[PDB]
Amino acid sequence: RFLKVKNWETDVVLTDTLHLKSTLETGCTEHICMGSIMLPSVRTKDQLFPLAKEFLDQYYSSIKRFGSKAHMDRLEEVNKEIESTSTYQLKDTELIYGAKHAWRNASRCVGRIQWSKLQVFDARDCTTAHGMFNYICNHVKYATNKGNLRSAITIFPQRTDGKHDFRVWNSQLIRYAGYKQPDGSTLGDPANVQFTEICIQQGWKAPRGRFDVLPLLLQANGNDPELFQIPPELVLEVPIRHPKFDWFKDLGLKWYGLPAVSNMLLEIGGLEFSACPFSGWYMGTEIGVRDYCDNSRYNILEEVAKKMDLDMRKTSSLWKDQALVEINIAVLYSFQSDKVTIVDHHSATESFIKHMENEYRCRGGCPADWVWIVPPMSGSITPVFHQEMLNYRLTPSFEYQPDPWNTHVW
Amino acid sequence: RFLKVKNWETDVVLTDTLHLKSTLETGCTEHICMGSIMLPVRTKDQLFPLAKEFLDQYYSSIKRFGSKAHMDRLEEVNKEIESTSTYQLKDTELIYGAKHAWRNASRCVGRIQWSKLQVFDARDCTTAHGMFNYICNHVKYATNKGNLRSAITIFPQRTDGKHDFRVWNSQLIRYAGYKQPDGSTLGDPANVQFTEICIQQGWKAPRGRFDVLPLLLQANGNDPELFQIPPELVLEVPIRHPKFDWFKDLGLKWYGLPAVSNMLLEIGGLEFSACPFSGWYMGTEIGVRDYCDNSRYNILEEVAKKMDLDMRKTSSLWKDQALVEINIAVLYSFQSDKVTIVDHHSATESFIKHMENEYRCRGGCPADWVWIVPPMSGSITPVFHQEMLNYRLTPSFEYQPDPWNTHVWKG
Numbered sequence: 164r165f166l167k168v169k170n171w172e173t174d175v176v177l178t179d180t181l182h183l184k185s186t187l188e189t190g191c192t193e194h195i196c197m198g199s200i201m202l203p204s205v206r207t208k209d210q211l212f213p214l215a216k217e218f219l220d221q222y223y224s225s226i227k228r229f230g231s232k233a234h235m236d237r238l239e240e241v242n243k244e245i246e247s248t249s250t251y252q253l254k255d256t257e258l259i260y261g262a263k264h265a266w267r268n269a270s271r272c273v274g275r276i277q278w279s280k281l282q283v284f285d286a287r288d289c290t291t292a293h294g295m296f297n298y299i300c301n302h303v304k305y306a307t308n309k310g311n312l313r314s315a316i317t318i319f320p321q322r323t324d325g326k327h328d329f330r331v332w333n334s335q336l337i338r339y340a341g342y343k344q345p346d347g348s349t350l351g352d353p354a355n356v357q358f359t360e361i362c363i364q365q366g367w368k369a370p371r372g373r374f375d376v377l378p379l380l381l382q383a384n385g386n387d388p389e390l391f392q393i394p395p396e397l398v399l400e401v402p403i404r405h406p407k408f409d410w411f412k413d414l415g416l417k418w419y420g421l422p423a424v425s426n427m428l429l430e431i432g433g434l435e436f437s438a439c440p441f442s443g444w445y446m447g448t449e450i451g452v453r454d455y456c457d458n459s460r461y462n463i464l465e466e467v468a469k470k471m472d473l474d475m476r477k478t479s480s481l482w483k484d485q486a487l488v489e490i491n492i493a494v495l496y497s498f499q500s501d502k503v504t505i506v507d508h509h510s511a512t513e514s515f516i517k518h519m520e521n522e523y524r525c526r527g528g529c530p531a532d533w534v535w536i537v538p539p540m541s542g543s544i545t546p547v548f549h550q551e552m553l554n555y556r557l558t559p560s561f562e563y564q565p566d567p568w569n570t571h572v573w
Numbered sequence: 574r575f576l577k578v579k580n581w582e583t584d585v586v587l588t589d590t591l592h593l594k595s596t597l598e599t600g601c602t603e604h605i606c607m608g609s610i611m612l613p614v615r616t617k618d619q620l621f622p623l624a625k626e627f628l629d630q631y632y633s634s635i636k637r638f639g640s641k642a643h644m645d646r647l648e649e650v651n652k653e654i655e656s657t658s659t660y661q662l663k664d665t666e667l668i669y670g671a672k673h674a675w676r677n678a679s680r681c682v683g684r685i686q687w688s689k690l691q692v693f694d695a696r697d698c699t700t701a702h703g704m705f706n707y708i709c710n711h712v713k714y715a716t717n718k719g720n721l722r723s724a725i726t727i728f729p730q731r732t733d734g735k736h737d738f739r740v741w742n743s744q745l746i747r748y749a750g751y752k753q754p755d756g757s758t759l760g761d762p763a764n765v766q767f768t769e770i771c772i773q774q775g776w777k778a779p780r781g782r783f784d785v786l787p788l789l790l791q792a793n794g795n796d797p798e799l800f801q802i803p804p805e806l807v808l809e810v811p812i813r814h815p816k817f818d819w820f821k822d823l824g825l826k827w828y829g830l831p832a833v834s835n836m837l838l839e840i841g842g843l844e845f846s847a848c849p850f851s852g853w854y855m856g857t858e859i860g861v862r863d864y865c866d867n868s869r870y871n872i873l874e875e876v877a878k879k880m881d882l883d884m885r886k887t888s889s890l891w892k893d894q895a896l897v898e899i900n901i902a903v904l905y906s907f908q909s910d911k912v913t914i915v916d917h918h919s920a921t922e923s924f925i926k927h928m929e930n931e932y933r934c935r936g937g938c939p940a941d942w943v944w945i946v947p948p949m950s951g952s953i954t955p956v957f958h959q960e961m962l963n964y965r966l967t968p969s970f971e972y973q974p975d976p977w978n979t980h981v982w983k984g
């Protein structure tokens with residue numbers, strides 16, 4: 164019950180005690196492992212205080228003031244506030260701590276070595292979608308930083324009754340539209356076809372290109388969501404070329420610089436922040452492997468291999484594998500040439516191993532989801548493939564939440 | 574109770590009922606997932622329910638559940654257990670058991686073949702020399718001059734745990750590894766400890782880079798004995814590249830026959846501690862893991878050097894580029910010498926069809942995503958996008974400790 168994880172490439176054995184503080188459930192049982200399932204499918208006054216207590220206990224422990232005057236005072240004060248308002252408000256310090264630890268606890272994120280260097284934007288005073296748009300534009304500009312990317316989160320007001328939810332309807336602040344074609348195929352990003360529809364059904368005028376930046380669909384206080392166009396001068400994009408193949412240009416590929424997840428829910432001390440867009444910088448494989456080469460996304464492997472004049476008759480020629488490497492060389496080359504921050508999968512996974520070692524040494528563990536941490540190409544030549552990992556749920560946390568169009572009383 | 578798994582590339586959803594027949598524990602709990610952990614004698618007491626469960630499965634599969642042959646066999650096994658404390662499988666039951674242990678091996682991507690398995694009954698074997706004869710016949714049968722055939726050879730079951738049959742090799746055919754005084758390793762670093770045991774037992778080592786290890790065979794709990802597999806039975810493939818003529822000069826070869834010999838076969842509560850089984854290679858086992866793991870032959874550097882890639886920063890993906898060329902060479906060489914091999918694209922696509930069929934006809938297919946997804950190019954194979962449920966069914970193949978850690982030496 165004091166579990167060991169082994170690295171099978173280096174024989175390093177770490178001991179995990181942090182999991183004993185895990186709280187929520189994994190979906191697994193002693194009879195069945197669900198480690199590869201993508202999604203293992205308002206607080207009452209009594210639910211809320213233990214959640215608040217556990218959070219404040221670890222916050223005051225983290226500032227070397229556990230069991231202090233300020234500690235017990237703050238617990239008393241929040242306890243009174245929950246008895247009164249049936250909720251409470253975080254101090255700025257507690258909100259910053261909670262957001263940084265939500266990232267620290269994200270067992271699916273390989274980039275967590277950066278977790279303590281997060282810029283937190285308190286948007287809890289926001290009241291309208293126009294205000295949300297303003298807050299989001301400032302986030303995008305701050306985070307983009309002319310290509311020297313900086314991690315950031317913007318936190319809108321917390322859920323109250325569940326009818327007054329703040330939501331960003333986009334899955335990412337910056338994503339490309341998807342359109343169904345008259346014949347049968349799909350133009351642009353197939354992952355966003357339904358959302359691209361709801362933008363049109365709400366009033367958007369689509370350029371119907373392959374890489375049209377979608378508008379924002381912002382929902383304040385539970386009202387109907389409103390469309391806004393992010394100023395193009397704030398959307399940094401990178402044209403994709405190859406350092407060897409001059410014909411790579413003509414494929415006409417580009418991607419955006421800023422990965423900014425906007426559809427998740429941030430839980431801190433039992434409080435639920437349904438609108439909390441956060442952003443970092445890309446690992447190259449997210450774009451070159453998944454966005455570009457998933458059969459259900461832009462699905463370009465066919466195109467690139469033809470231009471490389473590869474033997475596409477036999478799978479055993481590994482023509483897909485060859486094109487895949489070249490595509491991912493170009494993505495990294497393109498961002499690096501334009502001085503936009505990006506990290507390759509070798510550097511990122513090497514950094515995550517160092518981070519695991521830090522977290523085991525200074526925290527007693529690091530929840531990690533191997534299925535998500537290992538990159539989708541060249542898995543076993545990255546160090547994380549050989550690293551045993553324990554997955555468990557710690558709070559503060561980022562969680563998935565239903566898409567709001569399946570929920571909103573329009 | 575029912576469970577669903579979704580393929581996120583095709584939106585195909587399958588429903589698992591077979592997990593209900595699972596009883597062994599996974600290592601996970603409601604509060605921790607140990608899905609990436611590599612490793613998470615019986616008495617008459619517990620043995621008859623294990624036998625009954627297996628015999629119920631067996632007679633269901635032959636459409637004879639509840640028949641008089643079924644009931645008499647249960648009676649016969651019951652009496653044999655209480656009077657002798659163990660029991661003997663019929664030939665039919667052993668064949669069924671071995672095939673179903675393969676069918677239940679959740680880490681194996683090649684299970685579409687599970688029903689096509691040649692079972693060699695070696696339960697009459699008594700000495701290490703007899704084990705050697707049985708293993709030579711298996712190697713020759715399975716190799717079939719390059720037209721590989723799956724096979725398993727089953728040696729006598731455990732009795733009191735003091736008379737175990739064991740194959741001390743982890744694979745029947747594997748290359749030696751030697752630690753040099755300068756700290757480097759010649760040959761296969763995975764096999765240094767076993768090589769040292771063989772040398773200590775009297776093996777005269779050629780001390781080269783691709784030396785086929787001798788068999789080290791333990792019969793009836795006795796001290797193990799060394800044997801050299803006849804070299805004419807060891808089919809090997811010299812590795813060359815279809816475009817790069819310098820690749821042959823790296824001096825690489827590999828053997829044709831993957832034959833795991835260190836696992837334990839459990840059938841109906843009986844434990845077969847010596848049960849070597851063999852199929853054919855998926856290309857990435859050799860080209861990615863054997864050649865390119867840092868802890869194995871580790872050829873990424875010298876290949877990338879001769880390819881003259883930009884090796885000064887990893888963001889050139891020089892490692893990824895050399896890795897693909899190595900794996901093209903492995904597949905090219907095997908096909909050119911007409912030795913059976915399967916690339917990871919073909920193998921994972923067959924597995925998905927297998928898995929869907931198993932959900933249809935059997936109600937499930939336990940599968941370990943961590944092991945099923947190939948170690949290169951993961952998400953461009955279909956298993957990456959496939960949700961899987963992992964659970965333990967019997968009959969099964971299990972890990973067991975290395976015999977040198979447990980053996981009491983006779984001297």
Ligand code: HEM
Nearest residue numbers: 266269271272273274277314315441442443444445446561
């Ligand atoms: C700064 C550089 C960062 C890098 C290089 C990085 C890398 C990654 C990658 C590659 C993934 C997998 C994405 C996918 O496969 O869909 C991921 C997931 C995730 N990241 Fe990070 N990330 C970074 C910053 C952040 C930040 C700032 C946060 C929050 C404050 C965060 C929270 C998460 C979460 C919650 C997930 C899981 C997403 C999901 O379940 O869909 N990341 N990250």
Ligand code: HEM
Nearest residue numbers: 675678680681682683686723725850851852853854855970
């Ligand atoms: C017929 C062609 C076969 C192919 C292409 C195949 C493929 C594979 C591969 C690629 C692995 C992963 C091995 C590793 O990464 O170390 C594996 C594991 C495994 N295979 Fe198959 N296999 C085949 C036949 C068989 C047979 C005949 C048996 C038993 C009768 C079997 C039982 C297993 C087991 C038990 C494992 C798990 C090994 C472990 O846990 O270390 N396989 N197989």
Ligand SMILES: Cc1cc(N)nc(C#CCN2CCC(F)(F)CC2)c1
Nearest residue numbers: 334335422424441442443444445446
């Ligand atoms: C902050 C951050 C940094 C980074 N490098 N990657 C990511 C991601 C992602 C993938 N995202 C795609 C859209 C979604 F499915 F809705 C959520 C998951 C996030």
Ligand SMILES: Cc1cc(N)nc(C#CCN2CCC(F)(F)CC2)c1
Nearest residue numbers: 743744831833850851852853854855
């Ligand atoms: C029958 C078969 C076919 C195939 N293609 N691969 C395998 C394998 C393996 C895994 N192997 C790794 C090294 C070992 F631990 F010593 C034995 C287990 C087995």
Ligand SMILES: C[C@H](O)[C@H](O)[C@H]1CNc2nc(N)[nH]c(=O)c2N1
Nearest residue numbers: 199200201534535957958959960
């Ligand atoms: C079914 C499987 O869980 C699914 O394809 C997962 C696998 N691993 C992943 N890993 C990352 N980083 N991102 C993903 O979307 C997925 N998808």
Ligand SMILES: C[C@H](O)[C@H](O)[C@H]1CNc2nc(N)[nH]c(=O)c2N1
Nearest residue numbers: 548549550551609610611943944
């Ligand atoms: C720690 C981790 O489970 C370990 O490296 C696993 C990963 N998946 C694997 N998958 C296969 N097929 N073979 C392996 O040896 C491993 N090793």
Ligand SMILES: [Zn+2]
Nearest residue numbers: 191196601606
């Ligand atoms: Zn699990």
